[PDB]
Amino acid sequence: PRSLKKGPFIDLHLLKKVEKAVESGDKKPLRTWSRRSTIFPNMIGLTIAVHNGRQHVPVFVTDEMVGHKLGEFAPTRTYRGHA
Amino acid sequence: NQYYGTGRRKSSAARVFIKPGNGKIVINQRSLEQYFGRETARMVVRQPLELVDMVEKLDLYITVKGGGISGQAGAIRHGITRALMEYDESLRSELRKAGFVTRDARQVERKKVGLRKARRRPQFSKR
């Protein structure tokens, strides 16, 4: 995990949108490609449409999700049995 | 004055000085029995003086470097045999018979490309 010296990581271009989304009240799902960004507490109760490689997947930020990376909630590979 | 021999074995080299005296042996300022813990080394370092039967009439100061236990033990035996042939050349015909004069040339064989070792080839399969 990221070195505790540095503190958790978020992308600026996502944070700028989380800000105005909190001001607006998550009026619409916030599309993002920052799968690597960490879920900060200010994000709780927002819906972020995280890219998965071909689609944006709605994640509803439950309070239990804090401190995980967004991408952990958007699986990238499809499997459904061999036969 | 000192009588001298250089000897070597594998990567180990030894300088041996021998002089008349009451049988003392010293290696790197340590006793023979302190420097070597293995009985084979303790035997091979004596072998030449045992066969010459002078173990109680000569003393020797040794330094040895490089290689492991047996390399240094053989290097010391070789240096001892050279030095004592310098002390008494008439013993050479005996030491030749003892086989000590031969500088053992069995160096380690270098690794070769495509082989795991000197000669160990990778496992082969027909298919």
Partner: protein, 151 residues
């Protein structure tokens, strides 16, 4: 080899008892080049066998080895359309090699609490004309005499 014949490599006698035969025995019990481990095991086994037997170490070892050295072995001999087992008078150096190999491999597979003690037990049994090394010698002789018709 088909071109060459090889002169034997120089062995060094055992440092404590002066025996090249005991040196060969050590060299057979040795594993992974851990010579000094094998030496320690052999010396412990020989001293305990000595105190059991009331014999010198080399004497007890020799009288044990006498009981297991084979006199004949079976060799596959080809014929223009068949193969037969035929008994052959094994030569003394191979006799010693076989006896030492059989002793060692018999001891190795014993259950006793240490290799030195396994070895001491197996040498006692061999000197007592009993046990796995002896039954190995025995069945070799049985097979030889069962094939004697082709000799």
């Amino acid at each position: 080899p088909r071109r060459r014949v090889i002169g034997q490599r120089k062995i060094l006698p055992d440092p404590k008892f002066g025996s090249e035969l005991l040196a060969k025995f050590v060299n057979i019990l040795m594993v992974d080049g851990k010579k000094s481990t094998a030496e320690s095991i052999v010396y412990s086994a020989l001293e305990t066998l000595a105190q059991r037997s009331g014999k010198s170490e080399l004497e007890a070892f020799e009288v044990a080895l006498e009981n297991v050295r084979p006199t004949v072995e079976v060799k596959s001999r080809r014929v223009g359309g068949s193969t037969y087992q035929v008994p052959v008078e094994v030569r003394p150096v191979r006799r010693n090699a076989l006896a030492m190999r059989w002793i060692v491999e018999a001891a190795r597979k014993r259950g006793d609490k240490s290799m030195a003690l396994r070895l001491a037990n197996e040498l006692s049994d061999a000197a007592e004309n009993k046990g796995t090394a002896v039954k190995k010698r025995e069945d070799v002789h049985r097979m030889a005499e069962a094939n004697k018709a082709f000799a």
